[model samples]
Every structure is written in C-alpha cells, then in structure tokens.
Target chain A: MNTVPFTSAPIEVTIGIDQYSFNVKENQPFHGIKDIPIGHVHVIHFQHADNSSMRYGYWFDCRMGNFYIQYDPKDGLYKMMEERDGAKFENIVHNFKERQMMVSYPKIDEDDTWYNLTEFVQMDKIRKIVRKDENQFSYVDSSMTTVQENELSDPAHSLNYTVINFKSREAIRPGHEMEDFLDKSYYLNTVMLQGIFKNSSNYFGELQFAFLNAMFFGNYGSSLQWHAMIELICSSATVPKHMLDKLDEILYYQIKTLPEQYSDILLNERVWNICLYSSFQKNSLHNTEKIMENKYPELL
Target chain B: GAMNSSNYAELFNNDIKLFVDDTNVYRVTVHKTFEGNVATKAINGCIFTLNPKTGHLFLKIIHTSVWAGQKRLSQLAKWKTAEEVSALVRSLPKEEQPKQIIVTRKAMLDPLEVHMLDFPNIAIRPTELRLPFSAAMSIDKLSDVVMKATEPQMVLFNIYDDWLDRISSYTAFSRLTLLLRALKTNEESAKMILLSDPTITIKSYHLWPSFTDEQWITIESQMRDLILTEYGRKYNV
Candidate 1:
C-alpha cells in the first residue's frame, strides 16, 4: 500500500507594535526618550486638573500611535475620570475612626450613629465609581493598593495600582469597552512594529512586551511601577535594557511553566476565589474556602 | 334384397336420371372383388370410375364399419380407417391397378373434410400427400426416429405420447443448423424455420383437429417448406 506523506514546513510567525512617525534616532537627546522602536514605548495624554487630582483622557502607544482610555480589570470599567473620589474616601476613613472611638465610650446610640455613618460613606464611594466608571475601580483590596505621590506634578496626588490581578478585561466580561481599545491598540502596534522589523531586518520580539507595558503604565500610574512589576515577574532581576532584551524568554518560561504543575489548582481555586471574593466579599470567601476544601485539597 | 333392388331400380328410373335426354350422360363402371370371408363381411359399399378418354381409374372403399352406424369418428379415426380400407383396396388392385396406381382417399371421407378440402389453393400447395407416406405421418416417423436415437434410447417412442418433447428437441437442433444454412445458402426454408417453428403444422394443424383452414394452411406451408428442404438436404432427393 502506498501512503501519501503529510509534509509541510512550519511558517515563521511575526508579531509587533508601531507608534507615530517621530524619528528621534538612537543617541538623540530629548526630554524623555524618542524612536525607541515604536514597539517599546507607550504614551498617555491627559489633563491635570487642580480640583480633581488628574483626569486621564486616553492612552496612546508611541509604537502604534493609537489612543485608548485606562481600563480597570475588576468590574471591567473604563476610567475617563482619573481622580479618585477623595471626599467619599475621606468620609469613610473618618467614620470608621469614629466607630473605633465610639467603642471606648458608653453611648450605644452614638456608636450606632458612627457605624451607620461608616456604612453611608462606604455606600457613597461604591455608588460614585460603580455609577460612573466601574472598570477603573476595583473592590479587590489585596489586588489593588492606594499609592500616594507628594513630589510629582500634583502634591496631594494619589492613585490605585492594580498589582497582583490584572486580567484581560475581555476575559472578565465579554464585549467590554476596554476590549475595543485593547484590540485597536494590539492590531495597530502589531502591524507597525512588524513593518519596522520587516523593513530593517531587526528582530525585536521583546519590543512587543515593552510597548504594551509602556502604554499600560503611561495611562494610569508611575512608569516606575510598571517597570518594577515587569522586572519582578516578567523580566529578570537585571538592569532595564538587559531585562527588556530577555522579556520574551522570561514570559515564555513563565507561560510554559504555568500549566505544568499548579495551573488547574491556581485557576480553579485561587483565580476563581479572587473573582468571587472581589464580587461578593465575605460570602464568596467562605464559599470558596468550602469549595477548595471539598474539591481541591491540593490547592489549599 | 332382390325385391328391394328391383323396387330401387324402378324408383331411380322415375325419380333420378340414369341418362339425361340427348346429353347421354357418359358413365364408366369398374368391378371390385373381395378376397377373404372377413373382407366379404367387411365390404360395405364400393364405387369405381374409369375415365373413358384417358383410362384414368378412381376407386373408393367404404368400410362396413362406416355404414354400421351414423356416429362420427374423428378425422384421425377416419384417416386411420381410411388407411385400413386403402390397404384393403391396395390388395384388390395389386393384380389390376399395378404399382403405378395412385390411391387417393376421397375428400368426402368425412362431412368436415368434404367441405374444407375445397379451400382456394394458396401460392404454395396447402399440404401435399407423398404417395408412399403422408407428410404428417412421415414427419411423425422422423420425430420418433430422432427421439429413439437419443441417449437412453430404449424408452417408449410414441410420437403422440411425447410429440411436443421430441419436436422441441428437433426444433433446438434445427434452429442452429437452419441459421447456419441460412447464412450459407440464404434458402427460404431456413429463413422460414428461423422465423417460426417448422414443426408447428404437425402439432397445430394436420395432427391436431382443432385448427381452422386458415390456420392449417399457414402452418402447412411452413411445414411443407421445412420438410421439403430437410428431405432434399438430408436424403439428397
């Protein structure tokens, strides 16, 4: 019996990012930096308002030169308003302090009043973010941390950094507005950087990660925060340029190792618990614990 | 008997014309003689005629059995009786009639034959009786001979008993040979047999009484052509 051979060579896969046509070449001096392979830089443009901390308009990848608003992963909210609700936060903090102060005193009505005040403050804060831009605000206390800046552009500047948990907004909820931004950003960046690599024959595969990180950081928090996170988990503990060069290798190992041992447990127990607890807090936590104990003993 | 004869003569002279006036109806009478006591008992009625001009002789033998009863026998039975009578008649004229004498059973042997024998002659003869043996009887004999020649040959070979079986065998053999000859000679007999069964007349018309004149004529022509050709080919006659 004669058999037909199924033989086909694997095709080379090319992927990347693009920014605007600004030719600040290598060794050029500028305010920050220029002509970093468009794949490696992201720029966000916003208004710094005096009354409200600073409102970010949109994120633009210098690589792709396309703009998008900052998106919070928790509730899939698009944050057009960059400022936190300071008054609401202040009220909650003050009421909670009073509740602690009331416990030492002998007035049950006063204590009840303070507890109610705390509840009202928390409720107002939830309403402000939930109503306006639910994507920008997350209730995941462990995942997100409040960072204060005193010496930068604004003296009393504070912003929330979503540290441990930032999933693709589309993964959390389909048809998210953030998905439109991410898709446009991903395509434009990929096409432009691919054109650069094709034309120059410079294979900058790690430029893609640098570009995405730059865009994500430029829109919301300090660029240093983005660098630190990427360096800590995504990059090796080397200096910036070395870490950037090794980004692909680092990410490849990380993604490959993820599914090898603890992926099922991490996805089912930890990841599922995080989402559930973020959504339903104490009830979700308790149920998640019960579920882990019964179904996934190894995860615990 | 003598009284009845004179009285029949007087009645015939008055009522029937023995001789018409001026015409003088010419009649030739011939004498017949019976041999044995049994033949004398069996001799019922006889008629003889001789053509005065040509000396052509015609004789009819009617058996005592024929006049014994008005009840009719089948054509087969009549033919059988006629054959027996002919055999008797042949014995009479061995001394007188000679070997050249042609013995023909009258068409009027039966009422049906009397009416049917006068059918308008077709392009080919309806059926001709071979003097030594009839076409029908000869074909029957041929069928019997052919069947007896087959394997396990001692089996009873009555043509009437297994007429169809024998004819079918003959038909199968004849069809191939007939077609081969037709290809070779392009004879009408071969053509006719290939077109239709050559033995159909033996089964349908002559041997069987049920066929009409029209049917019999058609069948008879086919058989005549087949046998004539077959005889000519096989016997070289």
Candidate 2:
C-alpha cells in the first residue's frame, strides 16, 4: 500500500481596496448615518480543526465611500481591487452576524410570543383577543398564560389569574453566552431535524422551517451575517433578479423550501434588512456561494 | 464292439460329418448326447463360421445313438430327436444339471479377487497425479507414490484427483477447499468419472439433457484430452 500523507499549512492574507481616512471616536453610537465608518473592519481569524490558520482584514474605499477588498484565503491576500463597490457593506455585516439573531432567538423558544405576535399582526391585527374556538392563539396557550395585574384591587382572583410568564423576547444580544446558547440550541435542533430526515421519520412542514432556521443562522461564525443578507435578498421585493436567483439557490440548499415561503412574508423588507445587518460581520462571498451552490443548486 | 478308426469313419463319415456352417446343430447334437454326463467327453466335432467379419468360430458335435439302426434314414430321425433333446435341456433351469452347476461357477468368478489373492506382494497399482504441480514435484515422489498407489485404495485417489480438477474451479472457494482437504485425507470419493479417456477410440454418443452437437463434441474432446494427458501417459503405453 502506497500511503503518502499530504499536508499543507493554511494561508491568510489582507488586501487594501482603497484607503479611507476616518476619524471617529471608538464606541460612539452613530445613528441614521449611512457609511459612517464605525471602525476599520478588523481582521477575521479562523482556526480550522486541522490547526491551520486563516485571517483576512476588511478595508473601506474612500473614493466610492464603499467597502471593497479581496478575500482569498488560499493566497492569504485579497485580489483585484476596484471601486463603486456598492456591495452594501452593511448588508454583508448584517447577514454574517446580526440578522441571524432574529431567527436564532426562535430556536431558544419555538413558541416565543414575539413570533406569535408577529403572525397575529400579519394575519389579523385587529383581533386583540384570540377567539377560544377559532383562535390561533390557542397555539400560544402552551407558551403563554393569561395573567391579571393589580392584585390589591381583587385579592381573590388575583392569585387565580396571576400566571407567571416564561417567554423569550425578540432581541439580539451581543455576547458569547447568548450567542453560544443560540449556537448550541440551533446545532442540536438542526441535528435533530437531520436525524428525522435521515431516518425517514415523519415530520410536519413547520419542523422543516425550524431546522432551516438553525442551519442558516446557527454557529456559522462570521458568515452567519452574510448568509442572513443573502436570505433577505431572496425574500425581498426590491431584490435584484440576479441577486434573487442567488438567494433562491442559497435558501434551496440551506432550508429545502420553495422560494415563495421566504418571499411571501409580509414583513419581508424588515426581515431582509435585519438579515443584511447580521450578515455584514462575515463577508465570505465565495464560500457562501460554494456552500449555497452545493446545497441548493436551484438558487444558482 | 468298437470299430477301428477308419471303419468308424467310413461307416458314419457322411452322416456324422458336421457342417461348418451349421454350428448350432452340432452344438445341439453334443448337448443332447452329453445332457446327463457329469464329466467332459470327446465327441465328433466340426467348425462353423457364425459371422465372417468378426471371424466368430463355433463347433458342432456329431454323435451316434446306440439304439438307432445303422441306416442313414434312421440316424436322421435320431439326430432330430437329439436336437429336440438338446433344446429341452437348454430350456431347463440352470440349477437342474451338473453342467449348469459348472456354468454357474464360471459366471460368478471374480478376476480382480483372484488376482489379489494370487499376488499378495503386488502392492503398487497405477498411481494418479492430483496434487498441485508445485507440491507434487517438490514432495518425495516415491513416498507420495506409495501413499496413493497402494492396492484398491489407489482407485479412490485416482478418482479424487480427476473430480477435483473438473469441479473445483466452478465450486465456491470454501466448498472447494473443504473438498480438497477431504481428498488429501482420502476421506472423499467420487461416484462417477469426471473426464473420459481420450486416446481410447470410442465414438462419443449423445446423452439426454441434450447439448448442441458442437457443445457435446467440445466437451468430449476436452474430456478425452484430460484423461489421456493425466492418466494415459502416467500408466505408460
């Protein structure tokens, strides 16, 4: 037997697109301003399981007022710099990191009231009290309970109606604990769903969405945000045809769903924006494209 | 009471002369006269051809009946009666007479048994080659010969080698291995010959579960070669 162990060290590179001289105070919040240099995009590092190292730094273009840089992990350097790179730097950051937080929260509580509330708002905003018989709110009964406040006014019924709430809220937290919690939960859930499909067990359609949410947003490191943005483009009205095609391809593999499900959401724009923001932290276009292409050729 | 040889010849020559073409009648004559005889007796005899191509020769006996007259016509009647008597004796069950007892003895005799008994020291029979060529040539040929070539046991070894080659390749490896091991120990025996001897000039005939003529011919040719190459040369011309 001829056995030759082939090994190669991972390479990392940093490319400068166009130099931007921005003087902004660190940690200062700039609201409602587009292209306000929050900070020079820092170098992202990933240590593979094989102990090889990869690193890339983000550079901003001053002339085009856009973020443009080459990111080739093989060369350890960016290739072919250009401008007018209306590549939506924020969208990339949102997709890679922040936007996924939106869906990742649901895995923490599948019956999160915010999701129910969002659904209620979309379908029937005026129906305040979900009917007992024809009520979709019945689905939330397990996740929520009716509770009455002002115990002093009526002490008898106060204890009876004082059902404590244990619902997860809809908000993104920037820390490892929440991220780790979401990551682990998502990974577990995705594995569970995969197990179901792999074993050819029966499952409801909603379970598929739950799994897809995990696959797309869970533990993807920096690329989480970029993927989220791609998801947004797939679901958005203003989404360019080519971009939609790409988005369709990505979701096809990641979620295994028809395109209409992503696009038909009433709050698609808001969701898309959120996904864009989250994807921004990790702008791995090629890797994202490759993964999406392999998983979901329909999108390609 | 007995005449001289010439006198006997002159008196009965024409009547007693047996025709070579009529061996059946001559045999019938002798059988009739000796039907009751417990021992061999000399009688008048003649040669006859049964089949010219095969050169099959047969003998007829001529006999004289003491009670019959010396006239030829009287002797002919006696001869017919004698033939009838011969047919009757032949039709009788074999156990009925002393001659039949001898016939039974001859039919039951076993040549192989007799040979074995006669030559007790004749131990080696023709040996059959069956081992892998590598092993067969490498091993002490003499010892192997003694082991396989001994007496009636060599018959089995000869068959084992023949069958192993014919069926071994087609069988599952495990089964083939088991069979080969069994053969080595002389624990196995073949019920039938695997390949026919080729050098023997016998016309191959078709058998049921018929193969195409060409296929039959091929099989026969292969079997012939196999037997000749393996057995014929070893036994030597």
Candidate 3:
C-alpha cells in the first residue's frame, strides 16, 4: 500500500429554478437540472438531517432496465442481478470469499471477469491509504429548502461529499464523447470494481463507494453499483467540483484498507503464478502523454 | 533491451554446435538443491536454451506450484532413480540436445547422482540454483525473474488460484491484476507456459453467466462445475 487514501466525494443534486434550489428527496429525478435526458433517477441516498458534511453507502442503478449487483453476506458473494425485456435474473457472482487467485471474479460460478478488472484498473501503484477517521453513511431527510450561494454548510451525508474508488485515469478516456446518461457512461464498470471490495465483509464493507448509489441500498442492505446513476451525475458540467473531488478521495479509503505484508512466494510463489497465468489478459496499453496531464501525476 | 534471453537467441541459429558450457536449468522452488543437496516433496526444472536451436518450447512439469518455476532436476518424477530422467533426455532429438546440462546439483559427490547416469557423454554440470523471488512476488520482480531466469529462450508458469482457496491468509484477487500488469508486453519475443486450475485457466474468464438478487444464499452443490466443457478446446499440454 503506497498510494493516497479515500476521501468522500462532496457531490450534490439540486432541483431548482434560477437562484431558487434545494436538496433532492429519495426517488427524486433530475428536475430543474438543465438538459438531462428524460429518465427518472430514483435518488436513494444514505444521508441525514442537517446542512453539513457527512458520510455514505454502496449503490446500484435501475436505469438500464435492472442489471445490478448486491452483496450476499451469508455465502460471501455479490448476487449478480440483470433485467431484460421485463425478465430479471441473478445467476452469477464475482470474487469468492478467501480469494483463490490474487483476485478472481469467477462468473456466476463459471464465468471470469478478472480480465475486466485487470484491464480497467489502470493504476498500478498500491493504495497506501492513511486511514483517517471515517464517517459512515446514514439515513437522511432530503428537505427541499433553498440554500444561499457559496453556502458554507454542506449536506450531512449528501451525495456531494462521497468518494469514488477503483481508480484509473483510463476510466474516462479523453476525447470520447460519452452520453449524459449514467447507463451510457463508459466509467460505469470502473465504478463497480470498487463495489467488489466494499461488499466483501464488514472489514471490507467499511470501505466506501462513490456517493451516487448509496441511497438505494442505504445503511442496512446489500450495496449495489449505481453505474448508470453515477455516469449521469458526471454527465453535466453542472455537477459540483466538491463531488468530483470527493470521488477523487476514493484514493483515500483504498489506501487505508489495503493489507501490508507482501512477502515472497511463502506469500506462496507457485500458486501466485496460477492466478496470473490461467485467466491472465494483457494489460491495456495506455496513452501516457494524455494521462499524465490530469490529476494523476504518477502515470508511469 | 534489458532481458538476457531475448536479444541473444539470434546467435543460436539452426547450425550452432553444442558445447559443455551452453546449457542452463531453472528451478522453481525454495529448496535450491545442488548435487549433494536434499530436495523437497518433488523437484522441477527446464531446458530453456541450447547451443544448437530447437523447438521454442521446453516446459516439462511432472508436479507443480499451481503456476510458474524453473526445472528442478530433483522434482521430476522418478528423477531420484534417474529411471524417468533417462527416458526424458534420450527422447529429445540429438540435434536439439545440449552437450552441457547445468543444474543446482553438487559435483564433489557421485552416489548422489541419478539423472546423470544416462548422460555420461553430455557432461551434466552442477551450477547456480536459487529462487528468483527474494520475498513476496510483484509484477516487476516477476518480470525481472522471467526475464532473468538464467537465460531462458522461453519459460512456463503455473497459476493455481485454487490453492488460495486453502491458504486464506491474504487478499489476492487484485494482486492477480498487479501480477498480470505486464503479461501482454512480456508475450513479445520471450514465451511462457502457465498451468492453472479450471477457474483460473478456462472457467473463470468466461462471460458472466446468470442469476440475480443481491442477498444471502447457501454455497451448495451444482455450482462446482460452473463451465461448459464441450466447447473448451484441448491443447498439446
């Protein structure tokens, strides 16, 4: 673990007209927010009453007609949920408890998504998270009251303050014109990668998911990947800088939770090789020059 | 530009003659046995190059560590009696054979000898033997080991993600990604053999299958054989 830590994404969703605006309620859509495609976003969040900074939860989006993932603590796997033409199925799970390989997502029991994880997680330096005090996401009352411009008091557990993890400068490829919908965002899968860790166990669940989906699986249930919901939030430049910074803070929690000892193969060598070889895929080639230009300076 | 085997293979074309100094053996275990040295449960080794060039593949593993390692002469089955080693070396085409077979064995002793019984003319020399990993393996060191494996023309690795199932001391799923961070790039001039359990090798990477519901359930039967065997084509391995 030698990278930055996870910090909350100070994200916010406001429904308003001109200077008149306020926080959203559970199951609320992007109203008054200009130019978003017409899809109802049921805004479920893990927040609380009070105009102040706070914590969050794991998420999943239903926008794309029902494909989602939820943690099944009992058997130690994420129940994969998919919906098509009014049919919903939960056949697969990724990454078993007590990982067989360094990291494995055996599909629904037979498939493999490690290639996706390896390819998508473009950043290689370990997350040396300096675990600061953590703020957990909690139940909140979304009151639609107009707050002042440049208001100091932030949303208590608001989406605006949550952090996104499973980082890669590659998630958002430059110059790729992505649609404004969360379901349409290419970064959706990248976000789900974090959820894999977050749902592993209580020790793992203590980790964070970007603020977007925490609402739906709020505090007491299995967390889901709010992929579509997230992409949509980022779809507009109207999304606040705090939210993006909070997402960037995902770097924090990751750095915090990572285990320390990386001894040689007694850490076992041969078995280590098996994980790499069998399901191994080529690491994606990166556009270095462009990647370095962003907040990611450790691009090498 | 940095690896040993890549740029030098050009010298060992189809005509280079064999010599007592041209062979190398790579061992894949913590036990680095010399001629008199004791061995572990089994040993593993491989012939990565020859003075005279041969087929690019030389990976031979009677037993494994789930994935990758050098050929340990001691670990090969019947290797102690030299009975099987005799057949293994004799089976190779003479033109593809190396005059010298370097090993992590001792030269001072003679009864300790077994596999050498069949190679009287081959001058099997006792040589340097050590595990490449100093401690925990990483993507860079792994690359460094494969690239630095005593001058190999090609290599092999075994990935037994299944064992991680038994030794649940640490988290590895993500480490798998870190391990393979450089896999494709290494696939260039250098080559490797990777042995794996079904999940790691074939079943694990298949398309996400079916079922949904983000709640608890029982780990039961039926989930064991998760892949379709009818379509997974077999290879020479």
lDDT of each: 0.28, 0.26, 0.27
Worst 10 residues of 1 chain A by lDDT: A1-10
| Candidate 3 lDDT score at position A230 | 31
Worst 10 contiguous positions by lDDT, candidate 2 chain A = A1-10
* Regions more than 4 Å wrong, model 2: A1-43, A46-300, B1-166, B170-217, B220-237
- The first chain of model 2 has a TM-score of 0.18
Candidate 1 residue A154 Cα shift, in angstroms, is 13
Top candidate (TM-score): 3
- TM-scores of chain A across candidates: 0.19, 0.18, 0.19
CA deviation > 4 Å runs, candidate 1: A1-55, A59-159, A162-220, A234-246, A249-300, B1-237
DockQ of 2: 0.00
lDDT of 1 at A219: 22
By summed lDDT, the worst window of 10 consecutive residues in model 1 chain B runs over B16-25
lDDT of 1 by residue, B115-233 (tens): 21222120101112221112211233323432333221211222222223434433422332233333234345533543364433444322222334465356445655665666678
lDDT for each residue of candidate 3 in A202-267, tens digit (9 for 90 to 100): 111222321111222221111212222233233433333443444333322222222233122112
lDDT of 2 by residue, B1-107 (tens): 21223332222222211101222222222233346755322222221211111111122223323223433433232233323223333444644311211011111
Q: What level of docking quality does candidate 1 show?
A: incorrect
Q: DockQ, in order, for the candidates?
A: 0.00, 0.00, 0.01
lDDT of 1 by residue, A89-203 (tens): 3354345344432111123343332222111112223323223243332221111212422223431223333222223231122222223221222321232223322311122
lDDT of 3 by residue, B105-138 (tens): 3431231133344454555444332212111122
TM-score of the second chain for every model:
0.20, 0.16, 0.29
